[model samples]
Target: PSPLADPSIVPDPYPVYADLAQRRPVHWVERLNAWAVLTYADCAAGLKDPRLTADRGTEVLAAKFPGQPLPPDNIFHRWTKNVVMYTDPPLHDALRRSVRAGFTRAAHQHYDQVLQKVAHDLVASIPAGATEIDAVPALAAELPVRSAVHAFGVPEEDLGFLIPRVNTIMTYFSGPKDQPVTQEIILEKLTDLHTYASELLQGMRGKVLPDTVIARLAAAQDGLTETTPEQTVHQLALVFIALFAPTTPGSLSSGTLAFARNPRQVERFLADQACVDNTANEVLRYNASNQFTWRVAAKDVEMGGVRIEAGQTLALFLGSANRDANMFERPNDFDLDRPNSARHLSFGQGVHACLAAQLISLQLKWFYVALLNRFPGIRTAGEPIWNENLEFRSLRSLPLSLR
Candidate 1:
């Protein structure tokens, strides 16, 4: 009956979340050995609470592999150690500050033309008046990876090799830990990614690409006492996975699905380009890619009136919080005019909130503008298949008809 284990609820689990939020907002799931906090207020408050650390992965590994020496360092572990999202301050603050320059609007200014071309090319590839096309491959899957490459300053020629490997590495975040195939594939991909990053770092040494995020990060490495050049590269690799990976693709595809379900919104979008920003916010709330994020209690704390013991991990369900009836009236309704939609925790909260949020929003907004301008009659052709991954709600395929 647990939502996490029940594949039946994966397709649309908001009803179950509503039930749990009203009945047991802070219930502990024995299966997950973590508390499930569903209400918006609690999730928002808990995320900012310093007592709850983002070091849950390390805790989970230690508990699951007790008495064993930690696995030898590799790209994956190195990524875990250096990625800002996984560490606690002062380490977290330092790591985040190092890469923060790369994510700003100013940092991405030069790439605007590149992103526009990518979107334009992807939209143009689908024949006009086509009866059916899967938007996943035609558009969603390509945009994020390509944008990440541009933002990271990697040569566009390397994208062919990087895309699939990035996809493979992303699987590790949601793949079952008990499966050998998943682990094997993820390890193989991480090794490939690490090797490529090493070569890229070397290539970057003699270059002077000031506009590129990776170059800025590379130059800033001298000031960071805790991180190495290799660690910085690995962190960049994690940024590729975290910033773009499944979530970006999910945002585009799910946003498309939202428009298909609500034709009036699509018409509204067409009538006024300014509404695209509101539509983007609504899409983020209504179909959040990241369902939940983990945190381990650093000290005993009370959330939603429930006393959580120190050392207990909690799954702050961002998707659930965004849908809480108490937070937004008619919570289930997808309203582009929903003024408070920006308050949603889809990008998370506090120190770990998504650093690339603004850039991502702009990318999606541009996508909507370009797609609608190109094909005014796009609509769903068949049922969308949600990916089987429990941690992320992504569309595996979105069958659409361009009329």
Candidate 2:
């Protein structure tokens, strides 16, 4: 039995996603050992359901390496142990609240200032009258990495090394499995990064530094009623990981390219201030970044008329649902005027909805505004470099013309 086909051929991955959604929302595949849910409605339902556990836990490692003694001490295990992404309520709720407190209006404003500077700086970096520039690495990649570093209070000196390392690590998340990068190997990397962060956390714990989100999180500890030192550290790491962790090269770059594709739409967007935010949502809807979500069944359950057994795996195709003909009108058109663009599963849903949605929208808005204002002549230099991935759709390179 074939699992989902290799995405390399279909870097877009939407048609196959569409097929699964329409005809077989709960089809099981022997190769991948999971059931795939391709529709928007079904994916939303599962992400929010309490019965569907997000934690891969020990069983995943056990399944990957049956003969090896499950290495209990690894970074993946340590990181996932209390990461809010892998947790359920009470704890998830508590951690989310604390996180929300740090990602405040004040915090956003502060970060926005930094993001604005980075965008303008990058734009200025373009050699005036130069014919070509690769937007992804020059701007898309760097901005988010810098933004994430600022979010975590990671040192500027460390960022140079950190961004590339994070980028390399993230590459492994794409579609179909690659050689097993063992829990042990992952933990080795995590231990080094965590040690750096934990020590940074220790040094910054009580000292009042610049007014930044990281400092705010530290200051917030005294305010939380049920917080523990361990929970605090884990939450900090999670926030660092979450900060632009899923920055979609395809989503961000594609949005700009979408504008490039239709200059009239770009003009309309620039003319209307009200549409900027909604348009950002459209970019996410149109380009589902973190393309798939996975859920493990907790008990025998029925979804969309199909009965799914306990302990089975479910794959939710966000990209397919975002373009579902049944759910969206003119799904391919980059229409800001469409009926609210339908809530695409871009940022996710339920308890795991993206914590940085506000920040992401802000970054996009400011970046685009800067692009249009400072470099009005910017245009595509070459066809975007497209390739398939297991977890996300991204552009490897985006050659551009700034002149």
**What does candidate 1's lDDT look like per residue over 234-293, in tens digits?**
776776567457888998998888887788887888777557778778889987788877
Give RMSD to native, each candidate: 2.9, 2.9
Q: What is the lDDT of residue 238 in candidate 2?
A: 60
Number of the top-ranking candidate, with lDDT as the measure: 1
Off by over 4 Å in 2: 1-3, 59-74, 150-152, 180-182, 204-209, 244-248
Candidate 1, backbone clash total:
0
Question: For model 2, how does the per-residue alpha-carbon lDDT over 1-403 read when each residue is reduced to its tens digit?
Answer: 3336564544556667666666777777553456767777788788888778877555344333445544545556666667777777777787678766668888888877876776677667767667777878777776676665554466676665455445444544545555346545555555555665566677842332366677777677777876566677766666655553545456678787777676776776777876665777888888887777677788887886788887877777787778877788777788776666648888888788887777787777777777767666667878887755656677777887765
**Candidate 2's C-alpha lDDT?**
0.68
TM-scores of all predicted structures: 0.89, 0.89
Pairs clashing in candidate 1?
none
